[PDB]
Symmetry: C2
Subunit: 1105 residues, 2 copies
């Protein structure tokens, strides 16, 4: 069939957000297993404390993939992370994902768990339907097919711990047989349900130490880990980056075994190895590295390594290297194969084999390791070069083996175009993504294939990725440009300036691009028989070279044609063309009305015919007077020739009349500037004699005219007669009339639709000011070149970048020689450079949602999220805030009803704090919360002692009126002074309150203590405690009074979010009012009523003596 290549790769692995972190850990030896308490409490049910745990599971860019917020919450974490990983993998290989939409690509996902689905279907009465369309195993690949629009098969294998490699093998077979052009093979595994770990523990597969000491005597069993990995398998004809070539891949099962289903058989593994390598036609001597399964079991390791020895070490002298990524990252059950593939491919990319951890002495039951035939990579070793093999054996019996040929592509030899600046274009969700891609490209400005791949993946629609930026590399005056992209398509227009724009040495900077030089040479061929060559003028060094009219016109038209040729390479078809009279020849080119040869010859003949005719010198000057005003102001024999804009209207005529008009304007003071054209007044009645010879010559030149497109807007003939015969098709008559009839440029500019993206196609952006004023305010001029600029190529690339920032998609790769593929080895990974919009935090099921009242562990340790409690020190000892209990009850009620706290307005009633809980300096205090939904009552207990009691229930009908601030009893009109934060907390300290920084929230408070402002952060406890502090501040009583009862508390989160108003800084604040007459403390969306505080005796610890 056809070759199958690993073209891309992406994945999240333990303690590593991207493959770059995975490699940084592999080489550096950082063990990726940890003793954290993330998934569940360590030691629960006797399980090992160690496990492979991903850094996060709650980040997901829902808006990108079109998942509504309600569906995103119920979606499986594996599915979300796999969608992101798959997109990262597809763009890793330089393939724009849109180039695969609508094709026959397939999705094979190896998944062996549905914990989230079980968690979401626990409560039959409140379960939501879409939980099934996001938690089913089938959707693990069907969602990918739906979003990416792959028409190939969508299968979700299980195959009992070999799912990833089995999916890889199925994709390989599909691509080999021609059923599919490409495949997306992914592996997913997340540890959420402790009961599965307990089952594996009972089977004896796990290890008490959580270390997979593969290939070692102390091997006992593996430690479960997590991992989401995706690879892009494509046929060679469609790939850009080649990590390796799958020479052959196969699967077989152990069959029947006497010992049991779960006992591995080495004979079957040996047979699989031998069959695949023989079928591929390889020789065992070629293999250099074998990525063993390497679980680390007393039984599995001998079987597997003896199989590898009997299969590949039969007759080879030099030893065979062995490795196992499970020593580092643990064992991802279904995703194990793809993790090993990632390790192997990264090792090949960097030219080193990552060291294996936890290997000191070999297993005495493996003769190979004790001998020298089989060697383990205990320290980094350079890659000498050879084939590689990967084997993944599930405990059910399924065996998978793949043979990889590493990509050995030498770096491209230096070429002349290497020095030339190359343009880079990036698109992204957030400015950070664009800046990351730009910086990565900047660090590698000399990597042509890398820059081409980046430029390929950046052509994503602006709606999906509203941030774009360009960074011209290799230029001395270079830097990133980043700006937001407006939505909606914007028209692309062209402008071709007149005969004024000309300078000595134009086009040399652009002569280096192949397309431009080819176009200039074609123009020279068009003009060669006449007697001049455009390139001769360009390479020339005389200032007077271009002061000849014929030379000027020929060179200008040739350069404009070259610019249009460069534009057409990138795929830009103008939606409107409008040019000044020398320019229209080029405008004729833009629409296909004029052939290149015709246009160049026409320019030469215009220049000549102007040359032959001898007329009295006539100076054309543009004066700052309105077109209509110049109509009468223009002296007899002088007419307004060009209508540049409303402010400025060019006028031409005899040199003496024009000088007289200039003098008169100087007397008036109006802007009277005289241009230089060698005493020639264009678009004036003087040229009326030139036409006849020009008429004949052009009739000879343009043989069969062509229709004028609706895009072109002729400024030679007013808009009234745009349907006449004269302007129906370009010909000698049209060009002659343009050379004679006055220019109506201002008339056409009005027709440019609002939000257009204009391009000034000319050697100099002379009409930049004219376009900036005349055209509507919201249009972008985008000039291609500049006069006397040292390197016009950089300016042109910057102009293309500004096109990129306007929405129009142009590819700068077409402007340079193509990059042969596959790309050279060592081309940097692109997957790590992609970043998403992870502002939101979606739900991930907890370990207490599966079968086994609510209990909360208050750990004040540094890492614990409850660390802020260490600032609630009263009497010199840390106490749990009274409002802390309310948050616990709120969360428990929210979990009971099924809502979140932000979505659950609550009403506490008759709260009694029976005793105070002291938070120990070391350790934890466990608080239980019990509810009686029928009675609407709650009890918080601590070691069997009652702590808090009261009533809690959802607020059926919140009323925002309840939080309107009562009119203060004291007008306080003067308000001369107010207490700052420092002063309020100094007073509280003197009373005996030692609140730390976290529990300091009163930005200001009135002298009477009846009003103020409460700072808002993500924490409710701090906010409500600051309300209680405001209540206490105005009290005259001395000594620290602590709450003992509350009669009513209302929380309405919606009104709260509406009440917050940001200060001039970035801080969010809420106004507070305390009414001691009414016994209400109302601040933001909270309402405390009937607070009672009782004096607490001072601890008399009297630590000071």
């Amino acid at each position: 069939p056809e070759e199958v290549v690993i073209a891309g790769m992406s994945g999240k692995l333990p303690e590593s957000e991207n493959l770059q972190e995975f490699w940084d850990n592999l080489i550096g030896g950082v063990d990726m297993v940890t003793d954290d308490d993330r998934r569940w409490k360590a030691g629960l049910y006797g399980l090992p404390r160690r496990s492979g745990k991903l850094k996060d599971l709650s980040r997901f860019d829902a808006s990108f993939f079109g998942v509504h917020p309600k569906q995103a919450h119920t979606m499986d974490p594996q599915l979300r992370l796999l969608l992101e990983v798959t997109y990262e993998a597809i763009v890793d290989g330089g393939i724009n994902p849109d180039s695969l939409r609508g094709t026959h690509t397939g999705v094979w996902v190896g998944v062996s768990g549905s914990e989230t689905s079980e968690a979401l279907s626990r409560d039959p009465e409140t379960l939501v339907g879409y939980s099934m369309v996001g938690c089913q195993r089938a959707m693990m690949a069907n969602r990918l097919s739906f979003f990416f629009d792959f028409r190939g098969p969508s299968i979700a294998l299980d195959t009992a711990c070999s799912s990833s490699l089995m999916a890889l093998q199925n994709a390989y077979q599909a691509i080999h047989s021609g059923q599919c052009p490409a495949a997306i093979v992914g592996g997913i595994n997340v540890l959420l349900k402790p009961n599965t770990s307990v089952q594996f523990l009972r089977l004896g597969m796990l290890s008490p130490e959580g270390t997979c000491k593969a290939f070692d005597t102390a091997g006992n069993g593996y430690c479960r880990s997590e991992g989401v990995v995706a690879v892009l398998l494509t046929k060679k004809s469609l790939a850009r980056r080649v990590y390796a070539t799958i020479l052959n891949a196969g699967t077989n099962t152990d069959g029947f075994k006497e010992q049991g289903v779960t006992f591995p058989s080495g004979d079957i593994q040996e047979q699989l190895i031998r069959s695949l390598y023989q079928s591929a036609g390889v020789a065992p001597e070629s293999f250099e590295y074998i990525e063993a399964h390497g679980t680390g079991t007393k039984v599995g390791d001998p079987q597997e390594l003896n199989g590898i020895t009997r299969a590949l070490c039969a007759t080879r002298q030099e030893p065979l290297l062995i490795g196992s990524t499970k020593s580092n990252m643990g064992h991802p059950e279904p995703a194990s194969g793809l993790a090993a593939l990632a390790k192997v491919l990264l090792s090949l990319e960097h030219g080193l084999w990552a060291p294996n951890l936890h290997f000191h002495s070999p297993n005495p039951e493996i003769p190979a390791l004790l001998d020298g035939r089989l060697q383990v990579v205990d320290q980094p070793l350079p890659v000498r070069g050879g084939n590689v093999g990967i084997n993944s054996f599930g405990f059910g019996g399924s065996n998978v083996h793949i043979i990889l040929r590493p990509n050995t592509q030498p770096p491209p030899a230096p070429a002349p175009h290497a020095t030339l600046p190359r343009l880079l274009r990036a698109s992204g969700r957030t400015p950070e993504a664009v800046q990351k891609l730009l910086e990565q490209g900047l660090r590698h400005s000399q990597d042509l294939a890398f820059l081409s791949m980046l430029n390929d993946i950046a052509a994503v629609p602006a709606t999906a990725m509203p941030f774009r930026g360009y960074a011209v590399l290799g230029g001395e005056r270079g830097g990133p440009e980043v700006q937001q992209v407006p939505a909606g398509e914007r028209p692309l227009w062209f402008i071709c300036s007149g005969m004024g724009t000309q300078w000595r040495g134009m086009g040399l900077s652009l002569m280096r691009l192949d397309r431009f030089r080819d176009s200039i040479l074609r123009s020279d061929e068009a003009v060669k028989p006449f007697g001049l060559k455009v390139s001769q003028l360009l390479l020339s060094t005389d200032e007077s070279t271009f002061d000849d009219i014929v030379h000027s016109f020929v060179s200008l038209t040739a350069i404009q044609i070259g610019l249009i040729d460069l534009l057409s390479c990138m795929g830009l078809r103008p939606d409107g063309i409008v040019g000044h009279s020398l320019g229209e020849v080029a405008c004729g080119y833009a629409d296909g009305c004029l052939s290149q040869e015709e246009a160049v010859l026409a320019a030469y003949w215009r220049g000549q015919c102007i040359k032959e005719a001898h007329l009295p010198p006539g100076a054309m000057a543009a004066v700052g007077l309105s077109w209509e005003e110049c109509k009468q102001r223009c002296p007899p024999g002088v007419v307004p020739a060009c209508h540049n804009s409303k402010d400025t209207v060019t006028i031409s005529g005899p040199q003496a009349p024009v000088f007289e008009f200039v003098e008169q304007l100087r007397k008036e003071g109006v802007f009277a500037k005289e241009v230089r054209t060698g005493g020639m007044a264009f678009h004036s009645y003087f040229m009326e004699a030139i036409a006849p010879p020009l008429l004949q010559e052009l009739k000879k030149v343009i043989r069969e005219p062509k229709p004028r497109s609706a895009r072109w807007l002729s400024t030679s003939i007013p808009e009234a007669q745009w349907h006449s015969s004269l302007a129906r098709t370009s010909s000698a008559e049209y060009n002659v009339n343009n050379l004679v009839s006055p220019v109506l440029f201002q008339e056409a500019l009005w027709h440019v639709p609002e939000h257009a993206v204009v391009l000034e196609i000319a050697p100099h952006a002379l009409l930049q000011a004219v376009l900036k004023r005349g055209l509507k305010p919201s249009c972008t001029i985008i000039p291609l070149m500049k006069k006397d600029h040292r390197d016009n190529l950089e300016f042109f690339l910057a102009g293309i970048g500004r096109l990129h920032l306007s929405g129009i998609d142009a590819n700068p790769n077409a402007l340079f020689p193509p990059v042969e593929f596959p790309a050279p080895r060592g081309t940097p990974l692109i997957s790590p450079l992609i970043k998403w919009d992870h502002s939101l935090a979606w739900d991930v099921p907890a370990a207490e949602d599966f079968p086994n009242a609510a209990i909360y562990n208050i750990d004040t340790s540094s890492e614990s999220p409850d660390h802020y409690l260490v600032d609630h020190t009263l009497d010199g000892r840390v106490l749990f805030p009274a409002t802390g209990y309310l948050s616990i009850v709120w969360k428990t009620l929210a979990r009971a009803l099924g809502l979140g706290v932000e979505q659950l307005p609550v009403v506490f009633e008759d709260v009694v704090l029976h005793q105070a809980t002291i938070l120990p300096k070391t350790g934890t205090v466990s608080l239980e919360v019990r509810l009686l939904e029928a009675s609407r009552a709650f009890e918080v207990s601590e070691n069997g002692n009652l702590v808090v009691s009261g009533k809690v229930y959802q607020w059926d009908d919140p009323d925002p009126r309840l939080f309107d601030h009562p009119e203060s009893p004291t007008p306080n009109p003067t308000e001369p002074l107010f207490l700052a934060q420092a002063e309020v907390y100094k007073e509280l300290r003197l009373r005996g309150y030692d609140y730390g920084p976290h529990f300091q929230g009163i930005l200001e408070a009135s002298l009477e203590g009846d009003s103020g402002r409460l700072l808002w952060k993500d924490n409710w406890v701090s906010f409500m405690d600051t309300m209680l502090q405001m209540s206490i501040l105005g009290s005259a009583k001395h000594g620290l009074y602590l709450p003992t009862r509350v009669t009513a508390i209302h929380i309405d989160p919606a009104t709260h979010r509406q009440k917050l108003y940001t200060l001039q800084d970035k801080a969010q604040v809420a106004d507070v009012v305390v009414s001691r007459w009414l016994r209400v403390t109302v601040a933001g969306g909270v309402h405390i009523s009937g607070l009672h505080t009782e004096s607490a005796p001072r601890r008399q610890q009297e630590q000071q003596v």
Copy 2:
């Protein structure tokens, strides 16, 4: 070299058996694991080929037939 392609889209027995952390038997996984819907058949009948448990919903059986 015979192979087994079994179309299964449910693991209810896995959930019921693994509800009690302090009484769950180890071999509940062998008989209730989804992949065991084909590996067990291969083990008993001594089939040395593929053993895969597809998961496409409403079409797992016919997808297995196609494979």
